Each structure stands twice: as C-alpha cells, then as structure tokens.
Amino acid sequence: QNLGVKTATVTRGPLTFAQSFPANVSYNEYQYAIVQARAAGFIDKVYPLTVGDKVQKGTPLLDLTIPDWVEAQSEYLLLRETGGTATQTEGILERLRLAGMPEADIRRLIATQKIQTRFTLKAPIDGVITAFDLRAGMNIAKDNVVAKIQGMDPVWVTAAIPESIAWLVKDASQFTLTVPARPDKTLTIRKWTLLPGVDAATRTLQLRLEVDNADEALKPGMNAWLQLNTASEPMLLIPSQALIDTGSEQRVITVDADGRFVPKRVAVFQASQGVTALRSGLAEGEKVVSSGLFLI
Amino acid sequence: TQNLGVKTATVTRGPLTFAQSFPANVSYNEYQYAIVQARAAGFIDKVYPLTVGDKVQKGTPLLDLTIPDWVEAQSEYLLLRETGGTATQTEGILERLRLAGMPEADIRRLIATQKIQTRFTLKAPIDGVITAFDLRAGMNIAKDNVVAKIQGMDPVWVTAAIPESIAWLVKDASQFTLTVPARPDKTLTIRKWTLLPGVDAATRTLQLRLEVDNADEALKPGMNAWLQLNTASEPMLLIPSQALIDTGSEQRVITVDADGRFVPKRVAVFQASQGVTALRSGLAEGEKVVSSGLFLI
Ligand SMILES: [Cu+]
Ligand SMILES: [Cu+]
Ligand SMILES: [Cu+]
Ligand SMILES: [Cu+]
C-alpha cells in the first residue's frame, strides 16, 4: 500500500465504437443549371468550349436564329404601320410571347421596330460545364436542353452502411470525414441523410453527406474515409488499466470511505477505446484504483 | 370501389430484424483436457492396442502396472489381520494407502480372495479421443508424469467473427442459427454462448465463442459452419412491405378507416428488411392498411 496511487471510479454510460468507410465523391444532382431551347430554331457561333470548363456568371454561349416567329411578328409589324386598334397588336405580342420569345427582345422590337432573330442565351449562375459540346449549326425544336452547369458549393460523399449500424446513426457529430488528397483544413459537413434503398448485394444502405466546398477542392471520384462513432446501451464502465486478470481469474480493487482496499470478483463484457464494460460484479458507485501501486 | 377481396394489416410499434451470415470454425474445449498422471513411483506393463487417433468409448483400460514401496504397506496389514491387532490402526494404514493412491475396488478384492494386491490397471476418466500416449513396454515413472492425455467430444466449440459495433446487440441464444455445409442435421442445438475479450486489431472483431451439443459427435474441428445471426433496432413504425407502394417519389399506401373506405395517406420510409419496412414519420400506430389487396382505379 504505497501512496502514489490515483483513484478512479465506476461510471455508468455507453461505449463508442469506431469504423472507417469507403467514400466515393459525387456532384450534387441538385446544384445543376440547365439551359433549354424554348423554340425550334437554328444555331451559329458557339464560343471555344469543351465538356468540362469554368464559368463566371454564365455570360454568352452560342446564338440562335429562328424562322417561326419572324413570319408571325412581321404581320404585327405592318399592323402597327396600317390601322390596328391597340388590342390587335397586344394579341399578337401575346401569341409571340406565349410561343416562347424572351421579354427583353419583344420590348426591344416594339422600341426599335426592327424585326428580331439572333438571340444570345447568357448562362445562369457560376459553375462547371457538364454535358455540352454540341456545336456548329444544328436543328433544334421544342425545349431540348443544350448544356448544363454543375455546382461545387455543396459536394457529395456517399458511404456504404450495414443496416443495423445505419439505423443507429441520428446525428452529424458522430461522422468524421478525412481526405488523403487535401489534408490541410478539415471539411465541415452540412447535411446527412439515408436512402432507404437497401442494396441487395452488400447489405448496404446509401448514406449521403453534403459538404461545405467554397474553394473547390474535390472532383469526381476522388478518395475519402468516413470514421463514425456508434454506441451501446449503457453498462457499468471502468478504466481498463484499473482492471486486471490473466487466467480465468479477473477482477480489481475497491476503495472505501474508510480507505481500505478489498478485491471484488467481476465479469467483463466488451472493451473498446480503452474502457471495459462489465457484465456483472460491481455496483455503480464504487471507486477504483487507476495506474496505482500496491505490495503483497 | 365496392367489393372487398383484401387482407388487413395492423400497424405496430417495434424493432426490426437484420440477418447476417458469419464464418465459423469448429473447436475442442481446453476445458475437456483430461491428463492421466502417475499416482506414485511404479513400473509399467501391457499398454493395450491403442494408437493416438482411437476413441475410448468410456473410461476403459489404458494399461497395467505393479508398484514396489506400495507393497511393504499391504502385507504389513496382512500380518495384523492374522495375528489379531488394532482394527483402528489397520484402517489407519489403509487410509494412508488409499491416501497414497489405492483404488477402493482393489482393496475390496483383496479382503475377498486375500491374495495381496498384485498389479492393478488404470482406466481413463472421460469419454473421447487420445491426444498423445506413446509410452509402451515398461518404463520407470516417478511422481506426476502424464502417461496419457484425452480430448472430449461431448461439447463442441464453434467460433465466429463479430463486429464490436454489432456486439452488445446480441442478448440471447435464440438469434443464432447454426448450419453446416457438411450435413443437414436433426439437432444443431446450441446450449451456451459467450464472448472472448480478444478484439481483431486490424478490422474490429470480437470472437464469439459458441458451444454446441455433440452427442451424435459427427462434427470435425476442420468443418465449415455458417452462423445466421439476427440483430434488432430501436422501435419504429412497422408495415408489411407487400402493402407499401412506390417506385418514384410517391410514398404511400392504402389507409383504411375500417369504415370500408380507402384513402391515399402519405408516408416517409426509414428502411426495409426481412420482408417489412419501418417509417421515419408518416402514419399512426393502430392505423389499418392492406397487404394482399387487389383492385383498380
Ligand atoms: Cu417574337
Ligand atoms: Cu452489457
Ligand atoms: Cu495396492
Ligand atoms: Cu428509426
């Protein structure tokens, strides 16, 4: 019975299991910007682009010219020269605006009077070109999409989850993303969410994470690990060190108000993270010796 | 919507059951280890036709032997029986011999025919199989030398690899389902279960020691064994899968008032398993829905 001993204590509570997981990265199918062709027309220009580039605000991409409107709008044009009640001209401007013509061009046909055709469609938001490439002069009708833009303000990782473990997960703090490529600063998480779709091969649920990406960083199909921390229904837990065995004999020490140490027989359950969880043997309150010293 | 050819499902509160197969090897108890040691300084005889592989059905004859020293004591009692001596002291010397290591059956046999007890033969303690037992002829043996050693076949130990995360979710023997490729059997009945402290460092694994009754004994320690484990889940809303419908964003089924009237009530799923699903927010607990239901618009 030395004196250079530390006193611990049985605490009630649960254990924390960790695990690392295969994370493939993805482009949010939500931060996409599509440009669609409201009317069936023809193309010219195109600009110098490939399928995967950067944009500033969208700015100008490929310009069209269309036949179907000029015929119709012209009748309007002479209707403004010859006698035509206000209501007449509006009807026409209405059938043209409905047929698809941008507002900015109509008001600037009524003001310049000079018939309109070459339209430049300035792309939305910032972002990264996805799809595209279609160029030169092609025949377009009815809204067909000619391009997209992918966002990188939110980014997507998806881990494979075993179903029971997946069911336990109910909070963002247990996740912990790490990435080989960019150690540097860590990578805050904005959202987590499970896709009830139960993979039939691996008994794996899809668990999606959204990622706070400002300065870019992550591309398609990089490499990332996702350590998570599960738990367990609470057990009487003690420091592993304060515990000892060797054979079939396993147990430790009890400290008293009247400081005298009496060995007590206990039976362990699990022991992860450096803390054991006892099946039976001790009571919640009892104190215990951690990293101490005694003499037989 | 008038004729009713339908089944009804009570919605309920409760957990879910996840099945999982696990690798199992078969093993012998370190506990059944029964060694046979010498009761004293003696010498050898016989050594029955036994190899290492052979199974001793019961405790049966391992060998014969004779013992010196021992002898001085037996005959001394023999003069006392003749020349009327202290019955108490004769029993004392017998207790000292029965203390040295003399079987009760042979001392009975001695008073019966009287013939001093010459050589006696030892018989194995436990049923099973010999694991080392080579000595033959007659050699010199002193103290507690292990002459022979045996392995038990009555209980058999099968170990599975467990994930410590899924570990504490075990709780009872009925979840385990034990199956071996070797044979479809009448009794793959497991008696006891327990966990070893050892964790698999590289990949987190507990070693789940199981113990299976093996009277028939047709289980070899090399065999392969598949363990269908079953896990559970914090109680959720429980609906039979057959009656849950979607293949798009639409996420619901039939809601019944019990008034015989059907209605589209929207729900959100959490997960599915083993033939039913659990709903992370959607319907009420007692609400009725319809599996097996069949009709149109
Ligand atoms: Cu127009
Ligand atoms: Cu426990
Ligand atoms: Cu004897
Ligand atoms: Cu749940």
Curated annotation (Swiss-Prot), chain A:
BP terms from Gene Ontology: copper ion export; copper ion transmembrane transport; detoxification of copper ion; intracellular copper ion homeostasis; plasma membrane copper ion transport; response to copper ion; response to silver ion; response to toxic substance
GO molecular function ontology, one term from the record: copper ion binding
Keywords annotated in UniProt: Copper, Copper transport, Ion transport, Signal, Transport
One GO CC term on file: outer membrane-bounded periplasmic space
Induction note: Transcriptionally regulated by CusR in response to copper and silver ions.
Keyword Ion transport in record: yes
Keyword Cytoplasm: no
Coiled coil: none
Note: The cus system plays an important role in copper tolerance under anaerobic growth and, under extreme copper stress, in aerobic growth.
Role played: Part of a cation efflux system that mediates resistance to copper and silver.
Family (UniProt): Belongs to the membrane fusion protein (MFP) (TC 8.A.1) family.
Quaternary structure annotation from Swiss-Prot or TrEMBL: The cus efflux system is composed of CusA, CusB, CusC and CusF.
UniProt name for this protein: Cation efflux system protein CusB
Source organism of this protein record: Escherichia coli (strain K12)
UniProt lineage: Bacteria, Pseudomonadati, Pseudomonadota, Gammaproteobacteria, Enterobacterales
Residues of the full protein shown: 90 to 385 of 407
